[PDB]
Amino acid sequence: KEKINDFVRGHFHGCFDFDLDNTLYFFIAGRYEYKNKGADMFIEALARLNYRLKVSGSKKTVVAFIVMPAKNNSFTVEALKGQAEVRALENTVHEVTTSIGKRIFDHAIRYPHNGLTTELPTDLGELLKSSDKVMLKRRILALRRPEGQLPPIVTHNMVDDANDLILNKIRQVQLFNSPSDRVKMIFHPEFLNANNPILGLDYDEF
Amino acid sequence: KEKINDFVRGHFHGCFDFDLDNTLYFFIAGRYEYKNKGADMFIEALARLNYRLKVSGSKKTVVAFIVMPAKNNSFTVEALKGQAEVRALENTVHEVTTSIGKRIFDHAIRYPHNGLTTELPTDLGELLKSSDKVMLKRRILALRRPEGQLPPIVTHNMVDDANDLILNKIRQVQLFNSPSDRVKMIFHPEFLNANNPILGLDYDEFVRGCHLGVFPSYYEPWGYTPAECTVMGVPSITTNVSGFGSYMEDLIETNQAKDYGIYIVDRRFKAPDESVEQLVDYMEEFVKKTRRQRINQRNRTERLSDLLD
Amino acid sequence: SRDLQNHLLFETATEVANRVGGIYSVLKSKAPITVAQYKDHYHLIGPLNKATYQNEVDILDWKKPEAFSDEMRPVQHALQTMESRGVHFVYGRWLIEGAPKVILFDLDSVRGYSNEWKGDLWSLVGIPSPENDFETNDAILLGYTVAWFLGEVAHLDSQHAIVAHFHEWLAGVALPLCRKRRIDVVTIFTTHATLLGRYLCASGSFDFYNCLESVDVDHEAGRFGIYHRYCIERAAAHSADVFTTVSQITAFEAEHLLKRKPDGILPNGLNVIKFQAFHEFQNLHALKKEKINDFVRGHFHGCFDFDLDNTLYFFIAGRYEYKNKGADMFIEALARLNYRLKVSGSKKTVVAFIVMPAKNNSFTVEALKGQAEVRALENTVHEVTTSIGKRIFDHAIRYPHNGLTTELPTDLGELLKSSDKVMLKRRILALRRPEGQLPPIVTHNMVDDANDLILNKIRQVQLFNSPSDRVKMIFHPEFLNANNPILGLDYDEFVRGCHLGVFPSYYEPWGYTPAECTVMGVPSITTNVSGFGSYMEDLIETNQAKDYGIYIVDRRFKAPDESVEQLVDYMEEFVKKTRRQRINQRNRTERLSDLLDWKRMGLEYVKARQLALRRGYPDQFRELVGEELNDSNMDALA
Ligand SMILES: O=c1ccn([C@@H]2O[C@H](COP(=O)(O)OP(=O)(O)O[C@H]3OC[C@@H](O)[C@H](O)[C@H]3O)[C@@H](O)[C@H]2O)c(=O)[nH]1
Ligand SMILES: O=c1ccn([C@@H]2O[C@H](COP(=O)(O)OP(=O)(O)O[C@H]3OC[C@@H](O)[C@H](O)[C@H]3O)[C@@H](O)[C@H]2O)c(=O)[nH]1
Ligand SMILES: O=c1ccn([C@@H]2O[C@H](COP(=O)(O)OP(=O)(O)O)[C@@H](O)[C@H]2O)c(=O)[nH]1
Ligand SMILES: O=P(O)(O)OC[C@H]1O[C@H](O)[C@H](O)[C@@H](O)[C@@H]1O
């Protein structure tokens, strides 16, 4: 689940307004048979669940995955780029905490000498410097997305987007991952595999 | 030097009141020959250097190492315990920063939603929770040493502590590692080796880490100690009665030799007390150096390498 | 009557709180050394940018008696006199190192007088001024407003000499006004290019450095629709007591196109930030280079058959000006270098970067994918090595018991298990490229790929990153930025990671690029028609210059084919160097950086301001020095 979360943060970069500790992950998977496998019921029912959760004031969130192979030209630029930006934020955070660590350590080992009246740091300015702030802010800016852009409903570039049954149904029921939607749609038109660059999981692990 | 820093933090646990970024590391090394190798002049000059630095209001700290093997019963429980206590604080700090990291990250990734109005956290309490504060406080308490107890002048239990020359000399000059002393003394009565549990360095590594070797020998036909030291780009003090000292005194004009990090104390044509004062003038001169000037000197020292090959 | 040692400085430009071009960087980086000399006697003057001045200017009140000293009172009363007519302005500190005082004039508050001043300017100096040209209109409004102000300061300050320095034709209109009105202020004009220069080199077909001396300036300025602008630049050049350019090469073109031999050179310095330890720049180079390496492994995934420990990084960077920045020579020369390195049987590899912005639709799927696949291998290796460690450790802690005859494991099978292998093999399969596909020559999807000059030239010379090519090409058609997902470096970081800048410019009055590259301790190729190259040419004997990392191509006195060959010679000369030779060369290059610092270059601004005082007040200058010093040049004087 922590690997799915890592994917989900990337996918919702700039539009990340729910708690993953209060998020559930539904999925349908299999061979692309829109009728026989019930992708039509699945998507309809999700749209109806979305309504029910908004009406009922639920604070929970459902990210629903559809994993059915369709004809595609691989991952989108957006997918990869969002995964990279989150990864850059992680590394910049890891740098900053290594520095915070050295400053916490110094305070701790030095107490109670050189005017250190408290056992631990009390003011964040002792630990977080200008330099640290600047680069964390730049990482946040990179995650920002254009005014009014929403998280996509599909991770790949489709060969025939306009005629795809799954995507036509998701458009028809209007599940566009808006902030007020309690149910989110992610179509991943390909079998899962740990070699994937965005959701690096074998099917059984997912 | 950072490895020396790690040891020093342990050795001074609970009495750590100086900046290691403004701390210099002097050392004498060799075999236990109190007179011949000049341990007596070293300890004496350091005691006077301490006085000069307190009088001049110097913000520098010198930590003096003595590395000479004596008969011992291995490391003190205190020396080993202190090291384990610092190591335990480091691991707790690392646990805590991992948590802080997840909190910064969450904030950064979520901004500006869910009422996160600033790009970053502004209040420490968002990042540092009470459970973190508790385990840090326990590690700090464990580093605490009893009221009045000072950092030791020695790292090992000595066989016949009372009659040891180095220790009696340290006691006599009263360099007990007080907070007010700008010179600190650490006697390590064993040869250095990487398998050492408290100072896990080979001798060559430890020498590289220091700032100044101090080898005021009376009888030293050669003196491999300042030569090794010089080959590693570490400035050294020696004497004009040592082979190395006279051999270098010959090769460089004696006042220029300072600029190459070869300090030569006159033990031939001066009374012992004029010599001690000279050794102290050198130590004081070196302490007054900035970092940039230390870096330039070490370069010049290192340039001599070839001449000792 | 008037003091020449204690004197005022008014430095006027379009860009003073206001990022437009490179002049902003010059005046900003120069402020520290200027403020150190003048303190509260110095003022920068410019037009107020109402939209953006809030973020740069510390707005300071000018009415209080604590704003100015007793001797600097006249400037207060002069600003008051401007306020007496309703000329609205902003006094303040420019929020930059040095904290210099600025006077920003709101142009909207004199736009009524447009028609009067345009007419005055027409009959005085002959300068026409179309209404659709919004920038000359503003240049005119600025010039009259500033000459007015300097006229009032001259009236009210009878202690100090006044020096008025102007940068670029846009801030030049005040100069003919100061001359004709005979205002008691000595004037300097610095041009950072010429209008006819830029425009005559725009097509990339005109033989500029040879046909320059035979151009009918009025004719060409009419041909390019810039006659009115040309006259402003020309009037500013002629009216100024001292006339300056930023380089010897630009002084050549200035003399024939502006019809006045400049009185000397004002090359652009930097504010070089030193490191405590001289060698730290070497450390940084290795850290930044490791990030370039990381990018390259991804870029060449599946086709990685060379040693990065024996690879060099060349780059060009700048505005996309194919011909004027010599991206054409660069690519041509590299295709020739590639041939020489194959013939000689060198195992080395050059990876050449082109960093020049072109219209694009961001990174390619491929670029991002290979970076992620390499990253996935890294993580899988890290898991495996963690396992390996558990197995080594157990053996180490357990020896010599339970039949362990050797201190360490000896068979790889003891450490690397079936599941470890399967993982690693799968990561390797993800890095596999399709049969025949070569690493690309560009990292982005281009808006007009088929018609791009850079890509067409790479395709023409056929540098397609095949295994047998010793030179690789990577076009990165966007400015570098640490936020970039594939090469997360800022420009300065990337430059430090590289081995050689290559900037074979044709039109380049200064050459900020090779100067900045020099300051990072990275050697570079420039040209003798670049202002940086012409400056280094005269400062160092050109065979010694190579030992300092400054290679200088002759594009003035050689045919283009001879220039290309020389460019190949230098590139090749550099590849031959060992690591130890590269390190010593960078040390030499870094040592040379002190010369590009404003502490040294700002003396030339002093020499220009001296000459202005010596020329405007010769009788007083003679008697405040030992004797009559010569005034034909800045050099001749000092
Ligand atoms: O921790 C340490 C400290 C020092 N050393 C080594 O100890 C050596 C210095 O030892 P000593 O003090 O015995 O001085 P020296 O060995 O140079 O000569 C002295 O003792 C031996 C005799 O050959 C000489 O006549 C005498 O002057 C150096 O080679 C140094 O590398 C270690 O191996 N580990
Ligand atoms: O990725 C990059 C590449 C380059 N740069 C910056 O862009 C500059 C290079 O572009 P510029 O065109 O501004 O500088 P150039 O040396 O190419 O000068 C050119 O343009 C400005 C004019 O004043 C000069 O006369 C002209 O020759 C460098 O100084 C560098 O700091 C980046 O910030 N990021
Ligand atoms: O990303 C995926 C998704 C599904 N499957 C497998 O595909 C098989 C066949 O799916 P299908 O819907 O065709 O099942 P069937 O119609 O046979 O019930 C299942 O056993 C799944 O384990 C897979 O290997 N990777
Ligand atoms: O990138 P190169 O020219 O091979 O330089 C490589 C060298 O760079 C710096 O000097 C580093 O300090 C050296 O450790 C490194 O070996």
Short mmCIF file of N, CA and C in Angstrom, two decimals, chain B residues 161-245:
data_model
loop_
_atom_site.label_atom_id
_atom_site.label_comp_id
_atom_site.label_asym_id
_atom_site.label_seq_id
_atom_site.Cartn_x
_atom_site.Cartn_y
_atom_site.Cartn_z
N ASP B 161 49.17 3.91 38.34
CA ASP B 161 48.74 5.28 38.01
C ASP B 161 49.53 6.36 38.77
N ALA B 162 49.68 6.17 40.07
CA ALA B 162 50.32 7.16 40.96
C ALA B 162 51.79 7.50 40.61
N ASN B 163 52.53 6.51 40.10
CA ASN B 163 53.95 6.70 39.77
C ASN B 163 54.23 6.93 38.29
N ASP B 164 53.19 7.17 37.48
CA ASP B 164 53.37 7.44 36.06
C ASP B 164 53.82 8.88 35.84
N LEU B 165 54.85 9.04 35.01
CA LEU B 165 55.52 10.33 34.80
C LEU B 165 54.63 11.35 34.06
N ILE B 166 53.95 10.90 33.01
CA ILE B 166 53.08 11.75 32.19
C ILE B 166 51.92 12.27 33.05
N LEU B 167 51.25 11.34 33.72
CA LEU B 167 50.13 11.69 34.58
C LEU B 167 50.54 12.60 35.74
N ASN B 168 51.63 12.27 36.43
CA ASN B 168 52.12 13.12 37.53
C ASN B 168 52.45 14.54 37.06
N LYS B 169 52.98 14.65 35.85
CA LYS B 169 53.30 15.94 35.25
C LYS B 169 52.04 16.73 34.90
N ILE B 170 51.02 16.04 34.40
CA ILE B 170 49.74 16.68 34.08
C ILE B 170 49.08 17.20 35.36
N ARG B 171 49.06 16.36 36.39
CA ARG B 171 48.53 16.73 37.71
C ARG B 171 49.27 17.92 38.30
N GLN B 172 50.60 17.88 38.23
CA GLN B 172 51.46 18.95 38.74
C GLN B 172 51.17 20.32 38.10
N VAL B 173 51.01 20.35 36.78
CA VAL B 173 50.65 21.61 36.08
C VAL B 173 49.15 21.96 36.14
N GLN B 174 48.33 21.00 36.56
CA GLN B 174 46.89 21.17 36.83
C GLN B 174 46.06 21.48 35.59
N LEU B 175 46.22 20.63 34.58
CA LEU B 175 45.44 20.70 33.38
C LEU B 175 44.42 19.58 33.49
N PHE B 176 43.37 19.84 34.26
CA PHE B 176 42.35 18.84 34.58
C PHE B 176 41.11 18.89 33.68
N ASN B 177 41.22 19.56 32.53
CA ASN B 177 40.12 19.70 31.58
C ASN B 177 38.94 20.43 32.22
N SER B 178 39.22 21.56 32.86
CA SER B 178 38.16 22.44 33.37
C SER B 178 37.50 23.18 32.21
N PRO B 179 36.25 23.62 32.39
CA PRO B 179 35.64 24.45 31.35
C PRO B 179 36.43 25.74 31.05
N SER B 180 37.08 26.31 32.06
CA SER B 180 37.83 27.56 31.89
C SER B 180 39.16 27.38 31.16
N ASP B 181 39.72 26.17 31.16
CA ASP B 181 40.96 25.86 30.40
C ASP B 181 40.74 25.87 28.88
N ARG B 182 41.52 26.67 28.17
CA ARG B 182 41.48 26.64 26.70
C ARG B 182 42.33 25.50 26.10
N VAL B 183 43.22 24.89 26.90
CA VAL B 183 43.98 23.68 26.53
C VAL B 183 43.43 22.49 27.31
N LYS B 184 43.17 21.38 26.59
CA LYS B 184 42.67 20.14 27.18
C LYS B 184 43.71 19.07 26.94
N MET B 185 43.76 18.09 27.82
CA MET B 185 44.79 17.06 27.80
C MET B 185 44.12 15.69 27.73
N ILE B 186 44.53 14.86 26.76
CA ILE B 186 44.11 13.45 26.70
C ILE B 186 45.30 12.50 26.51
N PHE B 187 45.58 11.72 27.56
CA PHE B 187 46.61 10.71 27.52
C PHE B 187 45.97 9.40 27.09
N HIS B 188 46.49 8.83 26.01
CA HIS B 188 46.02 7.57 25.46
C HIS B 188 47.21 6.59 25.46
N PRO B 189 47.37 5.81 26.55
CA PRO B 189 48.60 5.05 26.81
C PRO B 189 48.69 3.75 26.02
N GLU B 190 48.51 3.85 24.71
CA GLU B 190 48.50 2.71 23.81
C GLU B 190 48.69 3.26 22.41
N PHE B 191 49.23 2.44 21.52
CA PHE B 191 49.33 2.83 20.11
C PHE B 191 47.95 2.76 19.46
N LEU B 192 47.73 3.65 18.50
CA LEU B 192 46.46 3.77 17.79
C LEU B 192 46.34 2.66 16.80
N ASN B 193 45.11 2.25 16.54
CA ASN B 193 44.81 1.15 15.63
C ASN B 193 43.31 1.23 15.32
N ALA B 194 42.93 0.98 14.07
CA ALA B 194 41.54 1.07 13.63
C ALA B 194 40.56 0.18 14.38
N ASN B 195 41.05 -0.91 14.97
CA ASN B 195 40.21 -1.82 15.77
C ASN B 195 39.87 -1.29 17.14
N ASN B 196 40.58 -0.25 17.55
CA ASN B 196 40.29 0.50 18.77
C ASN B 196 38.81 0.90 18.88
N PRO B 197 38.14 0.50 19.98
CA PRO B 197 36.71 0.77 20.15
C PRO B 197 36.29 2.23 20.35
N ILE B 198 37.19 3.10 20.83
CA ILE B 198 36.84 4.52 21.11
C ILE B 198 37.35 5.52 20.07
N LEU B 199 38.56 5.27 19.57
CA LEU B 199 39.19 6.10 18.56
C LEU B 199 39.64 5.21 17.40
N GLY B 200 38.68 4.80 16.59
CA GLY B 200 38.92 3.78 15.57
C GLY B 200 39.67 4.28 14.36
N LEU B 201 40.93 4.66 14.58
CA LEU B 201 41.81 5.18 13.55
C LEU B 201 43.15 4.48 13.61
N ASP B 202 43.72 4.17 12.45
CA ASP B 202 45.15 3.91 12.38
C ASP B 202 45.97 5.19 12.62
N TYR B 203 47.21 5.02 13.09
CA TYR B 203 48.05 6.16 13.43
C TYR B 203 48.15 7.17 12.27
N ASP B 204 48.43 6.69 11.06
CA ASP B 204 48.52 7.59 9.89
C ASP B 204 47.22 8.41 9.72
N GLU B 205 46.07 7.78 9.95
CA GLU B 205 44.78 8.47 9.84
C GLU B 205 44.60 9.52 10.90
N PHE B 206 44.91 9.16 12.13
CA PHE B 206 44.87 10.13 13.22
C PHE B 206 45.80 11.33 12.96
N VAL B 207 47.02 11.10 12.46
CA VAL B 207 47.94 12.21 12.20
C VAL B 207 47.33 13.19 11.18
N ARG B 208 46.73 12.65 10.13
CA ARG B 208 46.11 13.46 9.09
C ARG B 208 45.04 14.36 9.67
N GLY B 209 44.32 13.82 10.65
CA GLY B 209 43.22 14.53 11.26
C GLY B 209 43.64 15.69 12.15
N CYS B 210 44.85 15.64 12.71
CA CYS B 210 45.28 16.67 13.65
C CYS B 210 45.69 17.94 12.92
N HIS B 211 45.99 18.98 13.67
CA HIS B 211 46.48 20.23 13.12
C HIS B 211 47.97 20.41 13.32
N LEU B 212 48.53 19.89 14.41
CA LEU B 212 49.93 20.16 14.73
C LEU B 212 50.56 19.02 15.53
N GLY B 213 51.62 18.44 14.99
CA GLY B 213 52.46 17.54 15.76
C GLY B 213 53.46 18.33 16.61
N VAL B 214 53.79 17.82 17.79
CA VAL B 214 54.66 18.52 18.73
C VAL B 214 55.59 17.51 19.40
N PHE B 215 56.85 17.51 18.95
CA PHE B 215 57.81 16.44 19.25
C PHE B 215 59.12 17.03 19.76
N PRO B 216 59.12 17.56 21.00
CA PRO B 216 60.26 18.37 21.45
C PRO B 216 61.39 17.51 22.01
N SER B 217 61.96 16.67 21.16
CA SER B 217 62.89 15.64 21.60
C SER B 217 64.24 16.22 22.07
N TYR B 218 64.85 15.55 23.04
CA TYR B 218 66.22 15.83 23.45
C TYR B 218 67.18 14.83 22.79
N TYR B 219 66.87 13.53 22.86
CA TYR B 219 67.62 12.49 22.16
C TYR B 219 66.79 11.77 21.09
N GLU B 220 67.08 12.11 19.84
CA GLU B 220 66.35 11.58 18.70
C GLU B 220 67.31 11.61 17.51
N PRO B 221 68.06 10.50 17.30
CA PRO B 221 69.01 10.42 16.20
C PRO B 221 68.43 10.73 14.84
N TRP B 222 67.19 10.30 14.59
CA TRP B 222 66.44 10.78 13.41
C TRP B 222 65.15 11.50 13.82
N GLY B 223 64.10 10.73 14.14
CA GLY B 223 62.78 11.30 14.40
C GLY B 223 61.88 11.05 13.23
N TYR B 224 61.41 9.81 13.15
CA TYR B 224 60.42 9.43 12.17
C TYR B 224 59.05 10.09 12.41
N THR B 225 58.79 10.49 13.65
CA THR B 225 57.51 11.04 14.02
C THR B 225 57.19 12.35 13.26
N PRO B 226 58.06 13.37 13.32
CA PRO B 226 57.78 14.60 12.54
C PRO B 226 57.97 14.43 11.04
N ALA B 227 58.73 13.42 10.62
CA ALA B 227 58.88 13.16 9.20
C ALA B 227 57.59 12.60 8.60
N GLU B 228 57.02 11.57 9.23
CA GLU B 228 55.71 11.01 8.83
C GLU B 228 54.71 12.13 8.78
N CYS B 229 54.71 12.89 9.85
CA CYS B 229 53.86 14.04 10.03
C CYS B 229 53.99 15.00 8.85
N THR B 230 55.21 15.34 8.48
CA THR B 230 55.47 16.25 7.35
C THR B 230 55.01 15.72 5.99
N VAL B 231 55.27 14.44 5.74
CA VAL B 231 54.84 13.70 4.53
C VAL B 231 53.31 13.73 4.36
N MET B 232 52.59 13.77 5.49
CA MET B 232 51.14 13.91 5.48
C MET B 232 50.60 15.31 5.46
N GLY B 233 51.46 16.29 5.26
CA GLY B 233 51.02 17.67 5.16
C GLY B 233 50.54 18.26 6.47
N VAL B 234 51.03 17.73 7.59
CA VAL B 234 50.70 18.23 8.91
C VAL B 234 51.93 18.93 9.51
N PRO B 235 51.82 20.24 9.82
CA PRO B 235 52.97 20.94 10.40
C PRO B 235 53.39 20.36 11.74
N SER B 236 54.69 20.37 12.02
CA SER B 236 55.25 19.74 13.23
C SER B 236 56.26 20.65 13.89
N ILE B 237 56.34 20.58 15.22
CA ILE B 237 57.39 21.23 15.99
C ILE B 237 58.43 20.15 16.31
N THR B 238 59.70 20.47 16.11
CA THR B 238 60.83 19.57 16.43
C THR B 238 61.95 20.38 17.10
N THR B 239 63.12 19.77 17.30
CA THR B 239 64.25 20.46 17.96
C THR B 239 65.49 20.37 17.11
N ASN B 240 66.40 21.33 17.31
CA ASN B 240 67.72 21.30 16.62
C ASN B 240 68.72 20.25 17.16
N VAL B 241 68.32 19.43 18.12
CA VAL B 241 69.15 18.29 18.57
C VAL B 241 68.66 16.93 18.05
N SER B 242 67.59 16.94 17.25
CA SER B 242 67.06 15.75 16.60
C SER B 242 67.59 15.70 15.16
N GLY B 243 67.80 14.49 14.65
CA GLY B 243 68.33 14.30 13.30
C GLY B 243 67.53 15.03 12.24
N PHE B 244 66.21 14.78 12.25
CA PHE B 244 65.26 15.39 11.33
C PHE B 244 65.30 16.91 11.46
N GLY B 245 65.30 17.39 12.69
CA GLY B 245 65.32 18.82 12.95
C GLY B 245 66.55 19.49 12.38
#
